[PDB]
């Protein structure tokens, strides 16, 4: 269920859902697994805000255990293409793909909660068939792993070799460690 709220305006009272009200303030929610449907819905939200105002900062709250890679890369290109600075925040957890979209936000406008947790690993895949087909899908997923490490280093500032060693296996990073790693800029402990 979704609660309904009332927003008071000069013209009159209007009823809005909790998610649509925050959308009016340039706020988008990324919840659950990243799939083709959930990702395609967020893209339309970002584009809608661009037309309304291309000079106002956008806030993206992420709480998800990750998911499909191809669905997530469509969002990454969108954040970089549009002019507004896409602020990212990590709430609860940020998996492999959730971490890539987190660090891809605008520099200086990336935050993580004091008790949040980030996890990064290498891309997962698999195939069943002839040996010739396995080699094709193996070369393809290898390029993605190399591509995902290059972009992660670009925003984090770390070296490509360091990201390769840290992404060989699952690696959990606490909220303070993310700052030291260049993944985020600060922590929003209290309101000032």
């Amino acid at each position: 269920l979704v609660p309904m709220v009332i927003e008071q305006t000069s013209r009159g009272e209007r009823s809005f859902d909790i998610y649509s009200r925050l959308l009016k303030e340039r706020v988008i929610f990324l919840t659950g697994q990243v799939e083709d449907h959930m990702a395609n819905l967020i893209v339309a939200q970002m584009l809608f805000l661009e037309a309304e105002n291309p000079e106002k900062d956008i806030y993206l709250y992420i709480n998800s255990p990750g998911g499909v890679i191809t669905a997530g890369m469509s969002i990454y290109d969108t954040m970089q293409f549009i002019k507004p600075d896409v602020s990212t925040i990590c709430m609860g957890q940020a998996a492999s793909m959730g971490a890539f979209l987190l660090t891809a936000g605008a520099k200086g406008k990336r935050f993580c909660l004091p008790n949040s947790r980030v996890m990064i690993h290498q891309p997962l895949g698999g195939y069943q068939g002839q040996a010739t087909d396995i080699e094709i899908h193996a070369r393809e997923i290898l390029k993605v792993k190399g591509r995902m490490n290059e972009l992660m280093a670009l925003h984090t500032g770390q070296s490509l070799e360091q990201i390769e060693r840290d992404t060989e296996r699952d690696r959990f990073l606490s909220a303070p460690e993310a700052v030291e790693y260049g993944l985020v800029d600060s922590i929003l402990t209290h309101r000032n």
Partner: protein, 350 residues
């Protein structure tokens, strides 16, 4: 008698960066003087009156155009409002209120009322609101336009002259309205989106569609030039009401650079006012280009930047003006951009 070239030359002193609107108005006013001056009792009679419809952004100088014209113009001028009006004897205001307001400018002379011109602002605010299952009788909406139809075309309405000292008079004057000119204009909201869909291209939200990157970099004005009556129908106006106003004006926009021109070229510019205020004291006022640029940004940040120039300029010189009489042997005053921000104090020359 007034020649359109001569009247336009005079208006250029008070208006900057608006040319198309000047040509449109000059022809109408010249015809109006000619229509009222010439008896017209010839083979052709009852010459038609082309009413003017002004369109432009808020704070573009519409009120100044009518008032500055009224200053040099001999006939009286009034500034009414459409939002106050409410049809069919409602709480807000009767239509007749506009006429009685005119007589005060005309010193209760009927012959002078036909000569004068009328101006209305915020005409777009009475756009036909279209919500089907709410009232179906929009007092603020369409309903107001129906009442103005007969007014603009021409009719005689009873008007108590001067209001009357007491019941004793109990009489009313007959005032014609056919020969009276009407200038109804207001900054329409959302009109740019209406014409973009039908005229230029597949713009909007999507990637390939042209984004609104030029929010302030470019002027939307050029789009308004291609406006037509059919587009106003989608806005809410009735075709009958639009037929009453055949002429149209664009008034594209005011530019940051134009603000600098407004402070130097016009006769009534603020720079010339303060310059003469200090000239009598044996002091000179100097404005630098850097100082003007800072003023433009501050005015642009606030709403109705054109109307906010007085506040920015007055605050900057308020402190200096207080100490100028006290100070002696000071012949010049220099203002810098830093002073406009408030981090610096103007330089003084002895």
């Amino acid at each position: 008698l007034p020649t359109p070239h001569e009247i336009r030359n005079h208006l250029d002193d008070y208006v900057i960066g608006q040319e198309q609107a000047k040509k449109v108005l000059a022809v109408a006013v010249y015809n109006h003087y000619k229509r009222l001056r010439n008896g017209d009792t010839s083979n052709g009679v009852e010459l038609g009156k082309s009413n003017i419809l002004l369109i432009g952004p808020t704070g573009s100088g519409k009120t100044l155009l009518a008032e500055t014209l009224a200053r040099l113009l001999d006939v009286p001028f009034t500034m009414a409002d459409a939002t106050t009006l409410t049809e069919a004897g409602y709480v807000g205001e009767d239509v007749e209120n506009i006429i009685q307001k005119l007589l005060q400018k005309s010193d209760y002379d009927v012959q002078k009322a036909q000569r004068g011109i009328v101006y209305i602002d915020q005409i777009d605010k009475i756009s036909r609101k279209s919500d089907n299952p709410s009232i179906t009788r929009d007092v603020s909406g369409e309903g107001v336009q129906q009442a103005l139809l007969k007014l603009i075309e021409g009719t005689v309405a009873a008007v108590p002259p001067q209001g009357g000292r007491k019941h004793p008079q109990q009489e009313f004057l007959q005032v014609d309205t056919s020969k009276i000119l009407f200038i109804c204009g207001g900054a329409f909201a959302g009109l740019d989106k209406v014409i973009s869909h039908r005229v230029e291209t597949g713009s909007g939200i999507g990637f390939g569609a042209t984004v609104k990157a030029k929010s302030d970099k470019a002027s939307e004005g050029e789009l308004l030039a291609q406006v037509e009556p059919e587009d106003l129908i989608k806005f809410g106006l009735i075709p009958e009401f639009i037929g009453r106003l055949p002429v149209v004006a664009t008034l594209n926009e005011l530019s940051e650079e134009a603000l600098i021109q407004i402070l130097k070229e016009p006769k009534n510019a603020l720079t010339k006012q303060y310059q003469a205020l200090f000239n009598l004291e044996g002091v000179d006022l100097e404005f630098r280009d850097e100082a003007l640029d800072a003023i433009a940004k501050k005015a642009m940040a606030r709403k109705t930047g054109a109307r906010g120039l007085r506040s920015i300029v007055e605050a900057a010189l308020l402190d200096t003006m207080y100490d100028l009489p006290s100070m002696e042997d000071v012949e010049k005053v220099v203002i810098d951009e830093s002073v406009i921000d408030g981090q610096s104090e103007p330089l003084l020359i002895y």
